[PDB]
Amino acid sequence: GVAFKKTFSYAGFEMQPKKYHNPKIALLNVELELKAEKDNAEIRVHTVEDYQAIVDAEWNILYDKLEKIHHSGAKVVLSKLPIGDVATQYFADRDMFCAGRVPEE
Amino acid sequence: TNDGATILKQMQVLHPAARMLVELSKAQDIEAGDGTTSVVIIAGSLLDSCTKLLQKGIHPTIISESFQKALEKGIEILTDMSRPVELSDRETLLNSATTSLNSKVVSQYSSLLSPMSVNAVMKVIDPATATSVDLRDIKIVKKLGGTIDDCELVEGLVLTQKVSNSGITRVEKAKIGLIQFCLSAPKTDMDNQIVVSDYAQMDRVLREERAYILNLVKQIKKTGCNVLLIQKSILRDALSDLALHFLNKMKIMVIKDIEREDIEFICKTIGTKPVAHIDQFTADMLGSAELAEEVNLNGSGKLLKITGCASPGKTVTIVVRGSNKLVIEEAERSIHDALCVIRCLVKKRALIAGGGAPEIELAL
Amino acid sequence: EGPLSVFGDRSTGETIRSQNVMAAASIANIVKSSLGPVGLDKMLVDDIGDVTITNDGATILKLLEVEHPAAKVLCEL
Amino acid sequence: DGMITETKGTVLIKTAEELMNFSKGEENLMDAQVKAIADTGANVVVTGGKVADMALHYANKYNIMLVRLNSKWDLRRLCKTVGATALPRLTPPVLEEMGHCDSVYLSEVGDTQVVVFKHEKEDGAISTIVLRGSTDNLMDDIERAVD
Amino acid sequence: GHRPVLVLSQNTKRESGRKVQSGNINAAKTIADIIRTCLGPKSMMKMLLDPMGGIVMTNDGNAILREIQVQHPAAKSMIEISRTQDEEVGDGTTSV
Amino acid sequence: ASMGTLAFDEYGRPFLIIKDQDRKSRLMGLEALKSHIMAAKAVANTMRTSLGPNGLDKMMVDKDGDVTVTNDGATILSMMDVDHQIAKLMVELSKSQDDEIGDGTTGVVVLAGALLEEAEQLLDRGIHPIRIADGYEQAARVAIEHLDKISDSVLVDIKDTEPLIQTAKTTLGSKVVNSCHRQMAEIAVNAVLTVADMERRDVDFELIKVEGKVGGRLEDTKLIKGVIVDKDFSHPQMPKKVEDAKIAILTCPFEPPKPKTKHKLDVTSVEDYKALQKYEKEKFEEMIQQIKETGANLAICQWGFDDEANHLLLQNNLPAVRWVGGPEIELIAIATGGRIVPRFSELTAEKLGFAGLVQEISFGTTKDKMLVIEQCKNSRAVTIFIRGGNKMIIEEAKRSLHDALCVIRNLIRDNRVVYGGGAAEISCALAVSQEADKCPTLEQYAMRAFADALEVIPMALSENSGMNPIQTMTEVRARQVKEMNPALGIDCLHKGTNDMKQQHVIETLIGKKQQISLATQMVRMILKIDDIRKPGESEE
Amino acid sequence: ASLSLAPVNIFKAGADEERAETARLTSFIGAIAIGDLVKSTLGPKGMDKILLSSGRDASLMVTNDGATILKNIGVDNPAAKVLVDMSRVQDDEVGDGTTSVTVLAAELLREAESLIAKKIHPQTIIAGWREATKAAREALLSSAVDHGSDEVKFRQDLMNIAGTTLSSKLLTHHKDHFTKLAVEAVLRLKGSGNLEAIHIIKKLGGSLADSYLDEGFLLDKKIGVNQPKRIENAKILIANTGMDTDKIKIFGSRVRVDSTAKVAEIEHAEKEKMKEKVERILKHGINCFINRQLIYNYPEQLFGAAGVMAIEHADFAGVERLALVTGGEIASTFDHPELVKLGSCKLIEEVMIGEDKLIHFSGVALGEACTIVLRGATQQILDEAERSLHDALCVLAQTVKDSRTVYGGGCSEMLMAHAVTQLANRTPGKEAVAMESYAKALRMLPTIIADNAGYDSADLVAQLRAAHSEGNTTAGLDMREGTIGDMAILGITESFQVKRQVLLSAAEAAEVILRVDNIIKAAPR
Ligand SMILES: Nc1ncnc2c1ncn2[C@@H]1O[C@H](COP(=O)(O)OP(=O)(O)O)[C@@H](O)[C@H]1O
Ligand SMILES: Nc1ncnc2c1ncn2[C@@H]1O[C@H](COP(=O)(O)OP(=O)(O)O)[C@@H](O)[C@H]1O
């Protein structure tokens, strides 16, 4: 099969189960973190309601990605790009396994 | 210099015992003000006696206890030699100041400096029910030029800042106001910027800016103010060119770059109350003065004297003059010694003879 | 350097054997071109401009400055 | 990759809907472009620039072989030897602009990974001589002899 | 430590082959070209500066050659043969 | 015999083969083997004095002057500053033994040194080093099979931990913490048994937080079935003790929200300014109310928080802790049985952890405060909190307890044990010698050399205990041969008996097997090197 | 063959190692040198050292504290580093006994060197020392007395302990006054253990006898320009708010307008927000406002117009001490005035100490925070007085925590060593010699105490040994005259925790140093 070293687990990783008996593996090249939508994206708002809406929109974007991953039935998640602490805790809450920064090879 | 504390501080003695003596001189200067050479000489003499005492075979603990006993007896003797003094007895205060100044370079100018010191101390304290003197209330201003005979006892305050409002000097019946805000274009603590997308807005920007500045100046003028002190500012311009022009047009003396640490002294001297927002700038927060005039010292500089204040404050200012800078510093130190002598006479109102009489009585 | 503690250099076995053979081959190659009727002479300059045009092997080997012991053995031979 | 402006590009977001829809719209546009390219029958795509991650993902999804050529001279030579026109944009190629080759595959010669554009016919505009050998200097000398 | 080991001594040079023959012939040709112009009734004189401050203004080939210090051994041989010609018959020095 | 080659051609022309060949050094043949064996012998003889209960400690000073007093072989070799490549190989061998087993990092070095010392005299008699390596491998196989034969199985049940206590005591006997022998052994056993997947799976050491603080006494070291925290309560006026705490673990700072994307909020009028300040105040009040609504008694945050939130938490009777590290956040969540919540909107009563007591602890006249989160229901994380009279014994206690934890982990992985004090080594040497008797002549020498090198451990143990090595070891071997009892070893503590089973000197079978295997492989690898090419530049 | 003395070299350039004899010699020399240096500052007749810094600052210190001497020296001997760390940890755990523990460790290691010279394995010495430490600890625990139940007896014990702690310091000149000062300061903590609540202020000038414990609290801050300098029946609100250009914490916010009039409106709104915050603060009904952070010109002008004292930049320690001394709550939000408790004191005024002015709180409501003004003729004198007072306060706080007390003057060491000697006489083997050496060091400690005073230390120690063997379990050194006396009557009392910590730490450090048989040093950078 395949075996590789553990790759800089975030907080809440130790709460994830460490053994599965028939897992579906989600091989991804995706950064599951709270981050700017684009390096050249600027948000211009003039209302506190729009400010709260923007914050909730970023959170909802991350949670939509996480929900799409979770509803696929996969129990093990591997990604080239970093997987943040929020995603790690989200997967720990669903008894899933996540590993970010997995090398290309 | 002739001050013992200054001599000990200026030279780096490099030896732990000598550094201890320097700290001892500092402590004597703090508590008494003069007698700083005497305490160091006494300590040196005591240790010189201690070397022979140790050679005789005495442990340096019997020596210490015996020195403590001798010190207690000497304090008793000195108190027995004392003489009660009343602060209303001006002759005793003058004699003490003259004795303090006798050992300094300004000993020749004693008939002028001694009454100056006595009056300066008396004008910053209440002769009845006073236990200490805050020498920070007696500001010393050093100006080159002239001789020590030109020293002065300005009862108001003097400022080294120059009058920005050139062409207007010597305001009579001054109504001084001290502001702590800035007379410039509007600016918020938040990041602010004005966006222009039309030439009409381009004209409106400076039109409304001049309107805002003019409104500020009109609000200041409406209170009857005619002398304005502006606290120093760094983040934004404290006084813009437009504001200065408007203030000059309304005949108001403008004096900027007032230091933050000087606000307390200025307010105590004049009676002004600082204003940090134009909304609270009212006539009741102004300091009435008899005359606010900018004087020149015969081409050696310029000074700003505000002399004569309704409800005068509990502060005085001393202007020290001299041919060269070194004699000016030494004159300042000598005046400080005299002020400290009068201060340590205010508390512990006891007097003894000098001239080595207490020391020889102690020895006997 | 080591447990032997001898102030000098030591070579053992194939290294020293190859060194000796190299020195002997150098001495031979010095004079190998001066053999037989189609041989040619040599100039030897004695560091001060003295010139010795010679074909004799003994003269060449005596005039040369030789340092290796095996080369000295061949020269004295 | 998705084409970008030449002066400066700033994504101005003013509502939550735009923030939540921007990435999805960008990905949909990439998918549509790659699908349009693949719908012309193209099964090999050669590019002179970098390859985006989403573009590579959608090329893999539609079974498209990607080869990236850094040298513009190599790109021109490939166009000459295959019969294709180097499109300046990411539009699907028209029938005349599409290249053709008998076989394109990844192969290993010795310890070197190579990509071979192979013609079955003994024709074409460009022919390649593959030189083997035991030393780099020997192959350089053989190349000089070939020249 | 560990001084270098070598068969012949240091600063012992050696050249062989066509290079040596070419160098010898070129040195001889240079020596000849030095005094080529001092032959015949229309020869012109040369002024030599002796190391000891003297001046040798002469037309004889042997004097010119013996006033010149050279490093190449072939040039030394040429100067030697000029001297031998001078000593044996008394002239013909620049012809030989 | 060095400096590569020096020929300069037979025609006098330059002969340059390798760059800087006049500066590089070379050693080849049997001389290289002798040098390697002598360096390894020096390292092993340095390390052999730190073996057994009577072993002494090495006191290492780093390049910055910091002092470490230790008995751990791997730590000693790591602290060493060496240039010899064989010494680096020995350091790596100790590191390998520490990584795989965690105990016996000194026995491997002594065994390898003895093996190479015997190989030296074998080489002097004209035996190819490959033959020596093959004989060593054969003898190692025989010894490993004998170890499997003479092993014993212990119970690794929580109900009866006495064999585990005995094994941990045997591991800790050689360390300085033996003054609290049984206490340290028992806390190590309980720590390992608490954090362990029971189905013979691994023991994750990330769930054991070993932290030490100066002061107190070494006997004050205790096992906390919870988490120790270097932080304290944020506001100085909140209570220092919380009972039956309902902890809300949060990774969101108690600050107004901040979008990750670069953003600008434009204030264009006075109404906008008023709305903004009202929004900030309402956000503070809302987060406080959201925390309070779940019924939580205590709040723990990872990213700190500002004055308004601090005073609101104090005003609402919500003791709070800020700037808790991520690993500490995870440990608290694991121990208290609560989930980690990324924002207040997702905080619910079901995600709250429970701890029976949260307390703030003072440490004398030092103004330093630390938090204890203990009395958890079924805490799956544990903390070892070490005290001492100086930081050096604290570090030594840390590594000694790590050795004990590793040994109990090894027992969990495999419960077969052998008896120490040299009994296992003596029995293995006897087995190897018996096997060599019925073996062809040529490899008999290699196998007997392996047996003699195996005999070094009892000799070192006896020497460190002040007894005559050869006499005591020979007597013990003769007694082992006479009555069939492979549990007879060196009586290092002078208890009056040589039966090491009665003395309860127990060590893991896998530890001894790994020791023998690693020593044999390293000795073979060293024996196969016949040429050294060092730069020899002696750079600064 | 060792690493150093082998034909092949296994080390970097500059890296070396010291084997058995060399390592033991280096350790013993370093430990004995440290102990000899720190001693002679021990006991009532100990003398002070001068610590002359070699750095650019060239700081000068005069101290009798063992930890202070040991930390400010550059020691390269690793065993010296072990002893220095032991002294530092002892100072951290309790405020006293650093010199005692260092001297005990040095004497133990000297006896260990003597034993090693007699062909005794260090492990045997370690075992004997462990047995001796157990016996001595049990004897000391059995010798302790407790008086926490009785208030007057406990106060007398506190006085005795403070006097004993201060007897060896420069404060022994005014021991009575300083002992009363320290005991009052500790008792004002009302059982709290934190020593940060006791602030020490050092003012140059005046005699050491002029030092006093203020009946209230003293603050070294200033007051605003137009604010009252004297408040009677103060109602104090302690705060930790901005009070300076207070900006909304939305960092992405900005002002984007198209005219300067809008900018003026926005700045007026900001000033109005500051004014409203000041009004909310004043709604609490307060006389004095103390803020941890700075207060700018507009808020202080508003406070002055309201006639409220406004003290700014009182740091975390300052606001905590004010809360402890007045009972107020450190607030940061002012939307619920009824939920915030205000401090109270009878009078606030400005006092004149030396040439500096300080804010004085009189008639404080709680008083669980002290300020101590130290007067002295020298900065070194002030620093040493502060260190001695800190030692006394630490010991008194420890005694308040644990009221068990033992007798000083060498009595505790004498009985400890008596128990150790009994155990050694009851034990066969060389471990008996090890325990005898342990007891010898225990005797050596009061021997050094007596030597520092110039008395006949041998005769006094022999008399103490005889008395403790004859059942006189309270006999100790009477330093007043140089004889032996009753420590219970003379009131030479020590904290049990301090002595136990000294014994255990010294034994532990001696054990860890004695276990070393090789010192390996890496090449320094
Ligand atoms: N109580 C004891 N009596 C005799 N020998 C012991 C005892 N405890 C441990 N040993 C032996 O000491 C040897 C070394 O153990 P130790 O020094 O603790 O760790 P390491 O194996 O890393 O050196 C072990 O092989 C063991 O057999
Ligand atoms: N008045 C006294 N009479 C007899 N012994 C005293 C007296 N005061 C202090 N000592 C003793 O002096 C010893 C050392 O105290 P000290 O010199 O202050 O240094 P440290 O307390 O740091 O060890 C204490 O053990 C104490 O028993």
Ligand SMILES: [Mg+2]
């Ligand atoms: Mg004077």
Ligand SMILES: [Mg+2]
């Ligand atoms: Mg002629």
Ligand SMILES: [Mg+2]
């Ligand atoms: Mg071990």
Ligand SMILES: [Mg+2]
């Ligand atoms: Mg003390």
